[PDB]
Structure formats: structure tokens, C-alpha cells
Symmetry: C2
């Protein structure tokens, strides 16, 4: 038999988190084994070049739990196959839900995306990374994510993306120069419409064909690890793609869909009640962490799962227990994995452990911060006076979850304007505004995420059909933003005062200068201190006194206005002797000159 | 009330493993608390400048469990103090057993040592290291220990050692350059006799004054961590110093020594041995272990002369249970510490968990390997034929425990001769042999330990009263050996095939070329494999064939006979293509040229 009798029982249980070991296509040297979940199927057959595409050649046999199994001699790696499932009167051809690679027969994905029998043999050379990897313990380490869409990042030539293999070395080299710790990849799972960016997924178990083979993707991940970079994958349990050959009405009935019409994006939601659906999804989560050494999983649009109308009420329990058991299972099997959730409701305890009634994610996107911060900085400096509370109040909500600061691709697309485009004033000020924003984002509590091109201050919105405007890296302002982001990341990676985003890690210095739009705050761990002085107005401020707890010489660690970043060059000497009398209720104070639209980061000596 | 009633009960159970929180001298803001264990004392008094050394000025009060405690206003850090204990008719002055710092009023440690009140506030900068310390998992990682006597390493001026601080940057630069992962420091705990090397200990809780303050040592340990170096401390629970004011007959009776007269005399340690029966002794020792890992962030503790604890000549269950609970508490409170033992008997399960009836150490010195290897290469190449079995049979014992292949200070002393001195022939061949020894030791399964000065092959036995013969780094033969060790450690740090010391990590290629004294073996993890071919004769061998598992281009990753190491320059030169001919029972074979007295390490080409 293909299936152990314990297996079937686990599938009925909903506990088969190894299910990729048995479902899908698994080759031998003499043939391939096939296993399908089709509970309301009266018959199932595998069709392929290996058997005349004849529906009667290899009729899989019905086992328990709606599972079908069969062996086909001569079905070999690199063939395409297809399931012909019969629901009573009607018959239909379907793709493998567990397909490990899918490849278009036509050459165009939106036309056809067929399953290919594949062997997943790959040898890793990332032992050192995987032995030192730290998931949940990363709360006390700097986490700086570079978010990437692979096809859009760089083009080998106009309109043709870099392969997985070919992308590895350019991506690793650039990420290391930036100082980013992780790369977040928009969904890699097989999808027909390239314009979906991967969020409409048909092949959950198949890395997209456009950038190479499955093992090509592992080589990329393997390479990135040896270079010391983490890989977080975007994962879409929220919904499945609307493709007829895909998961939609697999048996001729609702299967991955809700059986009930009333509930169910529409219709193309996963029925989290079904034990098989929870199996399929949770196994896929571990599958990526298991076979591809993925460091983290990021779940988007959690609110669409948590509620039903985004006495039973709005909340969907099915989804919350699945989300909870999803996170529990990940951390049980991979204690150093990372789970990130984006939830646009104020659902509490997203970042909380399940045993405290939380969803069990390690991180939550602080999109409130993103909105508030962005709403603040588009406003003209004359007006930032009138909205001072938008900036300062971001910290009242900054500790409700373990948060990642969320500057994201969604923010720079659909008319929202490039981050650069968003900033006000002439070109010098926009580069200044962008340097200030990044400075404040790194100072603000929480982990940092920046999408491709934000590190240049790219002019145009993200277009998936092209590569980012790397040509702007030649004009001075834009290499300066890049130099600024790198220097911020180097400061971030080294100073432990920035690693602790708990309320302990922050102290207010001053937030009352609404008229001058100035903010002074402290970031602390143990003895170590970092002082942040921020000018959101062009008007340079002279003899601006800023209270500090410790006296003595202070150093100017970073100056947003240094010419190396494209600034006016207005700066403190870098040697600053503290005045022994009070300011802002503090024993000493630093008297500085605040450069235009700039951030000063200052540290005491030894 | 200095002592909680919970404090008294835990001390009575011998379960007070934080006992340093309360015993000894603890400075207050206006005075000092003193707490001493003297169960059979009728009176105990604190003497110091802070009371003009008057014995009736501050008489400690008896609490339960024989613990004495009292407060002295005006006793401040940097004050020297003394306990006056009255045993009936007789009175005696004693040092603090829990003294956290000691200094000699005379300025000679032997003539006198004094307990000085110290405050241990120190602000650490080793965040990244200790959040990433792998400890037990280090068994799967490369561990290369550089064993060091701090006073002997380098002298800042003739006959003057470096301070804890002064040594930090010179040593860390050296250890980083040579690629060792950890440094093991010969006992730094306060000791009267410098010539003891620290193994006769008076002040278990005080780092020796010779190199500076406690915080001075903290800077070094902090410093090395920032540089990525682990620190293992040598720890002596077997015996205390035979010093009259020290722990000998502390309260006027046998206290830290065994009460029984027959038990009191032990052949290696004479009258002074720790009475592991006493719960108070168990506290003092296990608290001390945790104290070093707690306040000094040390990564490991290495226990010497474990056989002297286990036997009395036979089994000492007191010592065996103390040993077991020592290891259990260590890993319970500091899961990423490392504990190492040297045992001169074949006692089983030194490296095994207590729950499997082991002693609970993580690592054991492979002294069998050391004696065997040294015995073999001490002998002349003409004779090595007749002792081939001594070389090859070393691996029958290499997987019995988790082993650290150790060449130590004890080997290079007392007329045993330098490692260099140990090797046969003239200087060229001696240097060749030493490159071979290090070559095989890095190839042989197990972690690696090399004592200071061995890395260049210094001539004279290690003399503690002087600094190493660094001037030999000017002569080529020794500068070559140091380069060879560096390259060996780099290979070790980068190749995971050397990290797994299980039997799975080793495969024999051929061992029966006894006549020509050549051995070939494989160090393999997963797909990765490293081929070691060793010629223990000064005649090079040509057209020597070596079987291989995989056929294809192979590269030569290391050649001991490379001119950079002081060698002939003989070698395959790379581009070695396995010949699809069977040899040594293997499918393919390599036709190699074996240089004189040399080690080859070869990798297939990817």
C-alpha cells in the first residue's frame, strides 16, 4: 500500500502536517506514485504522456478519508500529468493541488499551467546559518527586512527577469551592502496572472516556473543563507486563485470552498472547518519551512480570515483556531521560524502566544504607524505644526504588539505615489524628507521593513512589468538616500539600544515643540543610550537645548544633513560637551544646531 | 534581617546555588553586610579599618544553619577585611571564603592575601554573543580551543605580564587571526603560588589580582565576546589550597575538608579534598560554578582530575552525585554553557547525560588519543611500520564519548619536552611532523585544543616564569607551522564535514598500508566529504592510488608540504580527476603524489 493505516487516520484527524510526503507525485526509478484528496469523487485517473492520456490506463483506487492512490510504471520526473476526476454524470480534468512544480505547456502561464512530476533532491550548504538561526528570540535582535518582488527587482534585459540562480549573487551582494538582515519575497507559489504578484495562487507546493526549477529556488535560499541573509516568504492562506483547473470545485462540489453557500474575496475562501483543508494548508506552511529552509512566513490580510462580514456573529472561529493551530504547529516543528501577520483591524494579541488567547504570530505589521507617519510627512512643513499629535501619538500604540514598521509595496502602488513622490517640496527637501522619515523609522520602536526602490528614493511607483529605476542611483541625491539607509542599518545592527522595542527601550525627551516641529527621544538598553533629535522644518534651529540624563562629552553618531547623504552639511562638531544644568527635566542638556529637515542621532562616550 | 528564612532552609538543603547573593561581603550604600558559614564557631567577628580592627566592635550574629551575618556602617568597597573566628579556647584570623576580590598588603601573594570589599557593577556589551552562544549544539559546530596561561602569554615588560585589560586586544587579535573559536584560561581564581599555575586555589570567587580588578577581567571577557571568542575557565572542585588562612580548618574544625580522618587523606590531594557529603560544601562549589557563568559570562568550565574525585584509592558517591548535580544545575540555569572533564580512568559516560547514568559533562578530553598519537610520532619513521596499529586503532575509541582532542600544558612540562622537542629528526622534519600532527588532529574526530605556543612549535617546555619564544616567529620553520594551524582552523570553521564527530562523520578509506605508513580516511556530513591522505614517512610517494566514493574532478584544499608552511612544495597541484578504476574497494580512485611527512586534504569539485 502507498498509505499507512495511521496516515488515513491523521488525514481524518486534520493532523497530517507531513502530507506532502504522500500526496502529490513521488517518483521512483521505475515509476511514480500518485495520491489525491477527492472525497466526493466516484473515480480518479492519472493521465499523461506515459499512458496515451488514456483515462482508463491508471485508475487510482479509493482508500479511506477520500484519499486516492496509485502507482504508474514509466511515469518519470519531467513528465506532465493531469487528474481526471469523475463526479457522477460529469467528468473533469484538474491539476494536482500538491504539484511540486508546474509548467506551462504553451509557454504562457495564463493559458495553461500543468503539473510536472519532479524529484526534490537538493543538498544544502547552509548548516552554519540554520544552526545559528533564531526565530522568536529575534525580538531582542535587529530585524531589518528588504521586501522584494523577484521579477520586478532586476531585469537581465528589458522585460526579462533574473533567474533564481542568476538573481542569487546580485541580491546577496546588494542586501549585504545595504545591511539588511532578511529578504521578504512576495508570493513565490505558482500563479497564472503575473500581475497578481503571486497573491492569486494555484500551486501552493510549487515555486513559480518563471524564475527556474524548484531546486533553483533552494539554491537561491541556500546561497542567501551562506551570505547571512534571511528569507521570509509571503504566504496566502486567505484565499486560493480563481482558476478552473485549480482548486475550485475539485470534486465537482465544494472542497476547498465552503460547503454552505451563505458564507463566502468571495467563494474562493478556504473552508477552515474541513479537516482536509486545515491539513492541506498547514502542511504547506511547514513544507516551505521544511523542504526550502524558509526562515519566516508572512500572512497577509488576516482580517479577511478573522471576520466573516469584512448569534454566531462577525467573528469566524474556524479561521482563528486554524490560525492558532497553524502558528502552534510551526513553532513546535520549527522553534526558530518566524511568523508575521498583517491585520488591518485592531484585533488584539496578534503577536501574542496562543496560551494567552492570542493568534500566535511573532510579529504584526504596525500599519497604524505607517498611515500616521505617511499622513504626517506628505503635509507641507508649514502645516506639520498643526498635526504634531499625529507624529507623537504613534507611540501610544507602538507597544500593543511585537511590531514591524511596515513601509510596503501596497503603499507605493495604485496612485499612492512613490515614497519619494509622496514627500513635499523641491528635490533637495524631498530627499531630505525621505532621509528624515527613514531616520525616524529606525529610531521608532519596532522592526524595520522597506520595499524595493525605497532605498533609492525612487521616483516612480513600483511597476511589476519593469525593474526599479536603478539609473537614479547615478544622480547625487539618490545614492545619498542609499548611503543613509545603509548607515542607519549599520547603526541598527551594532547598537543594542535599538534591538529592544519594548516600552523599556524608549524614553521621551521632548515632544512639546509643536511650533518648531521638533522631537527629542531616547532609545536605551542597559547603560547604552541613543538620543534622537529631529527637525521636521527646513528652518535651521541654533542653540536648541536638549536635556540628557548623563553628562560629559557626547558624540554625533549620524547626521542626516551630511553632504555624503546629499545634505546642506549643517552639523554639530561631533564633540558636544554637556551643560551641567537642567533642560526638559533632565540634569544636563546638549546645546545643538539642528540642520534642515534632518535627524541627529547622538551617543555618550566612555 | 540579612537572610530570608527561605535563605536558611535552602542553605541547609545544600540547594542554595545563588549563595553568593548573601555570603561574603556585599556593599551597601552606607555600609557593608557580611555573611560567613562557620557552624562550629562560638564567635565570629569582622575586622577592618572601618572599625580600627577591633574584634569586639562588630560581632556577627548567629542565624540558623550555622550561617553568621552582620552589618557594618562605613565598611566600603576597597576596604580590606578579616574574619576573627573563635573556636572555644582558640581564636584565628581567616579570609573570606566568598571574597570577590583579594589583594596582598605585602604585595607578594605568597607572603599574604587579603579579602577586599568589592562591588561588581559592570556594564556589558556582549549582547550579540550571548544571545547566539550555541553551548550544547556546539557538538555539531567547530570548536577549536586555544589554551592559555594569562601571565605566561606575553610580557609587557620583562618579567611583567599584561593586565586583564592590556591582554584583551593583543590576544583577541591573535586568536581571531589564527581562527580558534574559544580560549581556555588556566585557573584565574585567586591563588597564592603563581608556580601552581592557579590549581591551588584560595579565593574561588575572586579573579587573581595579578592582572587587575574583577571588572578588569570582565572587560577582557566582554572584549573577547565582541570579537567573537568564547571563554572557557579552568575550575578546580577537586581540592583547595593548602593555605593556612584559607579554607583549611575554617571554623576551627574540619569544615570544607572531610570530617572523617580516614576520608581526609586522599593520595593525589593529601589532606585537602572537598567533603561532598556536607550540603554547605555542595552550596559553595555549585554556587561558584554558576557565579562564574553568571557574573563573568564565561562560556565554559573545565574540570580537571575527575578521577581523583571519583575514587578514593573505591567509588566516592558523594563526589559522583556532586558532579552530577553540578552539571544539572549548570545546564538548567545556563543552557548554553559548556562543561568539560578530564578523567585519567576509562570511566564510562563522562560526556553522557545524568538521566542516562552519565556524569553529565558535555565534553571529555581524549587523552587516549593524545598518548596514542604522541607515542606513535615520537618514534622514528623507520620504526613507524612496527607501530602502525597504534595509529589506526585510535578510532576504535574515538566515538565512546563526546571528545575534545587535547594537547595541553601538562604535556609540554616536567621533562616531557615541547611538542616540537617530541618530534623526530632534524628541524625540517620536526616541523614537517608537527604540521602532520596538527593535520591529523584536525582530521581525527573530535573538537580541538592546542596549548599556547604549540601553534608555532616553540622549542622549550612551557615556563610560567617567562613569556613564550615569540622570536621564533622570525625564523621560517615556526612561522610556517603557525600559518598551517591558521589554515587548518579556517578549513575546520568553514567545512561542516569536520563538525560531526559521530561514527557517521568518519569513513575509513584504507588503513593497511602499514609498510609505507600511509592512511586515508573520509570526513563526511550529508553530501559533503573531505579526503585525508597522510604520509608518515619522509620519502614522497608517487602514483599512489586512493579509492573515492564519487568520481569527478577533485581539488586539493590543503597541502602540509606547501612552501608557505615550510615544505618541499610537492603536490598533486589540483585538477585531480578520479579514474573510473576500482581501488580500495571503491568505484573510482585518485592517483596522487604524497609529499614527505605530509597531510593532504582533498574535496570534490563543485
Amino acid at each position: 500500500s502507498w498509505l499507512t493505516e495511521e496516515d488515513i487516520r491523521r488525514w481524518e484527524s486534520g493532523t497530517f502536517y507531513d502530507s506532502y510526503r504522500k500526496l502529490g507525485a513521488h517518483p521512483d526509478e521505475e515509476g511514480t506514485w500518485f495520491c489525491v484528496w477527492a472525497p466526493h469523487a466516484d473515480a480518479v485517473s492519472v493521465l499523461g504522456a506515459f499512458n496515451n492520456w488514456d483515462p482508463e490506463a491508471h485508475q487510482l483506487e479509493r482508500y479511506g478519508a477520500g484519499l486516492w492512490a496509485g502507482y504508474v510504471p514509466g511515469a518519470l520526473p519531467g513528465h506532465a500529468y493531469k487528474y481526471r476526476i469523475r463526479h457522477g454524470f460529469y467528468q473533469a480534468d484538474k491539476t494536482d493541488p500538491y504539484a511540486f512544480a508546474m509548467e506551462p505547456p504553451t509557454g504562457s502561464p495564463i493559458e495553461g499551467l500543468a503539473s510536472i512530476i519532479t524529484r526534490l533532491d537538493y543538498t544544502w550548504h547552509d548548516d552554519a546559518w540554520m544552526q545559528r538561526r533564531k526565530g522568536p528570540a529575534s525580538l531582542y535582535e535587529p530585524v531589518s527586512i528588504y521586501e522584494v518582488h523577484l521579477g520586478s527587482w532586476r531585469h537581465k534585459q528589458p522585460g526579462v527577469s533574473f533567474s533564481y540562480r542568476e538573481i542569487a549573487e546580485p541580491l546577496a551582494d546588494y542586501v549585504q551592502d545595504l545591511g539588511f538582515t532578511h529578504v521578504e519575497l512576495l508570493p513565490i507559489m505558482e500563479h497564472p496572472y503575473y500581475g497578481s504578484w503571486g497573491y492569486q495562487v494555484v500551486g501552493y507546493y510549487a515555486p513559480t516556473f518563471r524564475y527556474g526549477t524548484p531546486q533553483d529556488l533552494m539554491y537561491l535560499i541556500d546561497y542567501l543563507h551562506q551570505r547571512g541573509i534571511g528569507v521570509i516568504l509571503d504566504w496566502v492562506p486567505s484565499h486560493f486563485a480563481a482558476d478552473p483547473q485549480g482548486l475550485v470545485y475539485f470534486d465537482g462540489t465544494t472542497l476547498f470552498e465552503y460547503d454552505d453557500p451563505r458564507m463566502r474575496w468571495g467563494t474562493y475562501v478556504f473552508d477552515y472547518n474541513k479537516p482536509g483543508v486545515r491539513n492541506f494548508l498547514i502542511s504547506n506552511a511547514l513544507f516551505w519551512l521544511d523542504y526550502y529552509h524558509v526562515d519566516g512566513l508572512r500572512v497577509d490580510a488576516v482580517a479577511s480570515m478573522l471576520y466573516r462580514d469584512y448569534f454566531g456573529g462577525r467573528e469566524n472561529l474556524e479561521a482563528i483556531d486554524f490560525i492558532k493551530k497553524f502558528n502552534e504547529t510551526v513553532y513546535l516543528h520549527f522553534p526558530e521560524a518566524i511568523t508575521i501577520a498583517e491585520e488591518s483591524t485592531a484585533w488584539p494579541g496578534v503577536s501574542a502566544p496562543t496560551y494567552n488567547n492570542g493568534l500566535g504570530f511573532l510579529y504584526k505589521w504596525n500599519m497604524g504607524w505607517m498611515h500616521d507617519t505617511l499622513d504626517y510627512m506628505r503635509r507641507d512643513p508649514v502645516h506639520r505644526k498643526y498635526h504634531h499629535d499625529t507624529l507623537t501619538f504613534s507611540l501610544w500604540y507602538a507597544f500593543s504588539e511585537h511590531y514591524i514598521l511596515p513601509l510596503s509595496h501596497d503603499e507605493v502602488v495604485h496612485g499612492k505615489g512613490s515614497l519619494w513622490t509622496k514627500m513635499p517640496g523641491d528635490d533637495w527637501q524631498k530627499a531630505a524628507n525621505l532621509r528624515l522619515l527613514y531616520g525616524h523609522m529606525w529610531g521608532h520602536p519596532g522592526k524595520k521593513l522597506l520595499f524595493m526602490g525605497g532605498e533609492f528614493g525612487q521616483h516612480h511607483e513600483w511597476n511589476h512589468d519593469t525593474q526599479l529605476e536603478w539609473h537614479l542611483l547615478d544622480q547625487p541625491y539618490h545614492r545619498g538616500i542609499q548611503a543613509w539607509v545603509r548607515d542607519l542599518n549599520h547603526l541598527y545592527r551594532t547598537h543594542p539600544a535599538l534591538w529592544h522595542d519594548g516600552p523599556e527601550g524608549f524614553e521621551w525627551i521632548d515632544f512639546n515643540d509643536r511650533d518648531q516641529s521638533v522631537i527629542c527621544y531616547l532609545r536605551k538598553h542597559t547603560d547604552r543610550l541613543l538620543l534622537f533629535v529631529l527637525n521636521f522644518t527646513p528652518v535651521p534651529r541654533e542653540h536648541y537645548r536638549v536635556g540628557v540624563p548623563i553628562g560629559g562629552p557626547w558624540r554625533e553618531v549620524l547626521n542626516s544633513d551630511a553632504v555624503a547623504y546629499g545634505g546642506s552639511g549643517m552639523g554639530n562638531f561631533g564633540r558636544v560637551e554637556a551643560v551641567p544644568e537642567s533642560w526638559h527635566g533632565r540634569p544636563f542638556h546638549l546645546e545643538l544646531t539642528l540642520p534642515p529637515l534632518a535627524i541627529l542621532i547622538l551617543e555618550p562616550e566612555s
